[PDB]
Every structure is written in structure tokens, then in C-alpha cells.
């Protein structure tokens, strides 16, 4: 059921799927391919159920290839998309032969899939597959953009023939427009299970933010707005068991304390209601306001799943108890404002009890129930109904609601813009924003849309996994790397909250980090939240992510993915490739870990703030500088031993690995440092190396480069003396093989050449910091060649 997905991701190499598909949209190879297959599988499920002819047809189709029914359908679309996307300028379609080897699939199927892609019907048996895939292919157009565009592109294009065949499979197409809101997200799953069930016969497919697209079997019960409206009345009502639990003790306390007299007047109501001391007792003598809160004051602002349940499951909760004692309460403490006994009241303030009948009379009060309370059940309904007239409109559904006349309603909501009779919509959302959905949040949009059948599958667990960033482009495959990313697949997902009708998903930050969050999103806290972000993107098949404290923050469309925020930093800029983009943030992911170990708990806030600005500044010139941004300027302990040797040492290799592919400038820089780092251990065989014992000559040449006197020299004239000073100090300190010294010379030349190029751009003042950066980075590279498998 979900295992097909596992196999596919296991076969495609990490970088294979991370790659950008089309220049038109920010789509990942994996995102699109897996998605096409997902829909493909769901489609065949519908056919098997509805068409009995197609059911047997699909059955024989499986036997032809000796492939399990379900599995045969999925990989069909997945590969079809890949072979279609082989239109990338390379066309090296030989890549599929590797996939075929890991998939262990027959060539005949592929030969058919080739004619499914380019060609036409393999044969009439292969028709449902030809149809299913074509449908899914159309649904994931570069930018379908709108649900209506789907229908326009349907019929207009070759996809029309498939719709013609769909009708013959006793299956029709439909859609419902739905606007994104906080309330929609929570009950989204419930609706899918209740309204769009295979029981009624709906099989939901994908959503595009404008709404949802689904299927309708012939003679299926039509989509009815009645239940749509009936459901929220119960859901917009946060009637949890614990919501009802308080009043259980509230009014219990008011009455349980008088158990003495709440049983005695079962006989001789007069012996208790009357006293020899006078005539009668005060309500407060029998029910003190001290321990008793008035009924309507007890039920402050509740309606039915709370107040009618408070008039049912709370009138009869322990009312099996002192059914006799409970009576006096409603007979007397009917609370302030409404002393409306509205019953067989005799008007006697006290002797009424003797005149009335026995406990058979209780049932009559139970008849007065389901009256004023259920009024609130059908009261603010039309306030909400306006959404089902405007927001939840444009649908193949049927409106089952009254007209919106409600002659003279009350004012329209100040914020949600909805009339009443603010609004409860924002009120419910505000109670929710207290804890159920506390800010800030992580929102990931999907282009054009995302299969609902996959939206209920993905989850994640970063509790034990902590932060993990060790991946390779071609070594580890997508799945193995996804496993390291701590991603999970639960049909009953618990830590992911998807707005199924908005082609987007939100993740509450509370489950992601145990860190203390804030009321909003701040630049300081933004830093701490960033390392987890790229992982989320990768877990969601390389999809763009935005971090924000307001859900309705609409995200900002290059062919590449974009990790963005309320405010955008330069280092967060999207590079020419998704592979590179992720690696750039994976660099921060690694730096964060080290900083955590280095700075103290409180010191981290100020530490990270500085790292952020520095990384931003360096990346402005070249992204490669961004990758190496550790600091080496002003603001951090220059305690190299308490810094590099402490935690930066292991990830160094990975960081340098990234610096290798970010830019050609960085390619030259990385190679140069590494060449020198290899040469270093040759000369200084001994590991009695000190800080200055290895970098002195370098700094000597650097100071010389920057010495104002040498600056007036031409680019080549200056780099001449600069390197000449460096290598002079080297041979002053240690003799150099005339053979070996040449390697370093050539490398240093490019180093000083780029130094002139980072001086051509930007300012020489800033360039100095980058020199110090690379300086300490050279010692690091020397420690890395000295690593030699050191745990
Ligand atoms: Zn409102």
C-alpha cells in the first residue's frame, strides 16, 4: 500500500530526485514522478471498485505481467513520468537501465510504457493504464495553477479521449472549490473520511489550493452541503471530554456538600424545608454562594456540544445521584439574570416544594431541555453559512442551505468579514492559537498540487534523530538519505497537520523543536529554527518551505526550490540548482550543531545572531564564501582550540565537500587549500604542529599583499611579491624540495588571484576577514588530512 513508494525512493539516487524538473515551476524530479505514480495507483483503485468489467480487466492485466495488481499500477506512472522528463537536455535515457536493474522489472512492460509515453494504446487490455497515467500526467501540468484550468486543459487537449472512456467505466469527474483557513485544516481529514468515502464512492485525488478534485461513481449519493454544514457545527465546537469535565465538578461541588439534606426530604419535604427556628431556610443556607457558582455563570460562553451536553451529559452526569438532591438546584439556583423557571412553577418561593408532585416531574424539566440550548445550535449557523455560500462555493456539489436573507443580521466581522447575529470564527481560531496551533510554524506549498492519498502518509520524528545532515549526492539513494533525515510514513500521521484542501501543509514548531518558542517569529529565533527546514523540504521530495508565525502569510517561482521567511536574508538565496540550495542550508545545519556545543545556553542567542550576519555578508560576494562562513572576524572566542578542535573538526570534510561544487571559484579555492594541505603533512611529517607553526608564512604573505606599499602594484605585480613573501617565510622556517614547493606556488597564485577578484568586487576591508577565514580553514584542512580515521 505504501511499500511501492519505499522501493521507488530506494532506486532513485538522492540527486536524481532532488534535481529541478522544469524551468516553468519549482518542481523536483522526485516530487513530480512520485506524485504522478501516486495518483495513478489511486485511479485504478476506483476503477476496480466501480466497473466490474474494468475490475476483471485490471485483474487479467496483472496476470499478463505476473505483477501484483496494486504494484503494477503505481510504477507504471512513476516510470512514465521519468521517461517523459528524460526530455532534460543531456538524452542519456540510459539512466533508466540502472533503475530497471534495481526495480528488477521486465523490459516488455517498459517497452509498453515507452509506447504509452510516445505512441498510443499498447492494446485494449492496457487501456485503463493508458487512461490512468494520462489523467495523472494532465493533473500535474507544469503549473495547472487553477482547478478550473484542469477542466479547460481536459477536453481541449488529447486527454479528452480518456474522459470519454472514463464515463464508460461508470465513473464521472467532479471538483469542489475550498478557500484555505485555520478551521479548514483541522477537520480536513475528517471530511475526507466522512464525505469523500469509497463507501459513498468518491475516492479523493488531489487539491490545488483553489479547492479539491475528486471522482463520482454513477448513481453515487450526490455531494450534499447539508452534512458539510452539519459537521463543522460539531467541529468548530471544541467539545472535548475535558471541556465537559470542569462543570462535572463545578455544580457537583455546589450540591454534593449538602448530601445530608439532599436525601432527607425524600420524605416530609416540610421537615427540612420548614424549621422550628422560624419558617423556611435561605437558598444560600441550602446552597452557599461561597462553594456554589450560579448555573449560567458556571456555563459562561458555551452552546450545545458543550452547553446542551452540559444540559444532558452534565444534567444527568452523576444525576443518577441525588436525582432528588439535584432537583432543588434547578428549582432554586437557576442562576442570575434568567430566574425563568419556565415550568409548572407554583410561584410559592419556598412552600412550592410541598405543593408539587414527585420525582416523576423531573422528566418535565428534561422536556424543557433541547429547547433554548439547541437554539444556539441553529443560531450563528448563517454567520458560518456565508462561507458555504461564498468561500466553499464553485462546486459540483448541491447547496442544501437556506437563503442568506436572515432579514437584518448583525454587523459584519471586523476581521473575518463575516456577519453575526470580531466573530466566533476568529474566536475559535484564537483559542486554537493558544496551544493547539502555537506560532511559529513551518509551511510547505506544493506546485501544482499534492496527492491527498500521499498527504495523509508523510510524518516525521526529530525527537531521537536530533539534527542530522550527513548525505551524499550519488552514494546514498533518496530513501536511505530520507531515512537519515528522520522522515516517517504513518497512515495515521500524528506530527504533521495538512491543510488537505489548500495544496499545502503546516507543521507546528512545538513537535519539531523543544526550544522555547515566542508569540511571533523573530530574527534571533529564526536562526535556531532554520537547520530543520531543508530536511523537511527533502522529506517532502525537495519542496519549497516557508517559516512564519502567521499561516495566511502567502509565500512568494524559479525552476528551483526556495526556503524563505517573513524577512529574507541573502544567504537564503536560491542557487541555480536544488542540490546546491539544500547543501547551502545543510552548511548552516552543520554550523548550528557546532555553535550549540561551543557557546553556552544563553551565549547561543548572541553567538548565532553574529554567525547569521557573517554568513549573509560572505554569500553576497560568492556563495562559496557563504559555505565557509564560520567567523574569523570580530564577535566570537578566537579560542581556536576551544572552537575547531572542539566541534567544527568532523563536519569540516562535509563542509569542504559542499564548497567543492557550490561555485567554480570555490572549486579552485577548495582544490588549492587541499593541494597545500596534502603537501603540508609531507613537509611537517611530525604532528607536534602548533597554531603559528603552520600558518605563519601564509599570514606573512597576506600582510604583505595588504601592506599599502605593495597595493599600488598591478594585479600580477602585487600577487608576485605577496606569494614571494609567503614562500620566503616558509623556507625561512623549513627547507622546501624545489620539486614540492612548486605545487603550493601554483595554488597560492590562484588564492591571491581570487583575493584580487574579491577585491575587484566588494571592499578590501571585508576581503581581509575572508583571508583570516581561509587562514583558519587551512589549519582545519591540515587537521582533516591528519584525521586518518580518528573517532
Ligand atoms: Zn472573525
Numbering used by the authors: 14 to 103, 107 to 437, 477 to 611, 613 to 847
Give the published text.
To answer this, we finally pursued a structure of the isolated Cas10d subunit. The isolated protein does not readily crystallise likely due to intrinsic flexibility, however, we were able to obtain crystals of a mildly trypsin-treated sample and determine the structure at 4.0 Å using molecular replacement. The new crystals contain two copies of Cas10d in the crystallographic asymmetric unit, for which the flexible N terminus (residues 1–13) that interacts with AcrID1, appears to have been cleaved off. Moreover, the Palm/RRM domain has been nicked by the protease resulting in the protein appearing as two bands on a denaturing polyacrylamide gel. Nevertheless, the structure confirms the overall, extended conformation of Cas10d as observed in complex with AcrID1. The helical insertion in the Palm/RRM domain, which interacts directly with AcrID1 in the complex structure, has shifted away from the core of the protein by about 5 Å in comparison to the complex with AcrID1. Together, this suggests that the flexibility of Cas10d is mainly caused by the extended Palm/RRM domain. Consequently, it is likely that this domain gets organised when Cas10d joins the backbone complex and forms the complete I-D effector complex. In summary, we conclude that the extended structure of Cas10d is an intrinsic feature and not an effect of AcrID1 binding.
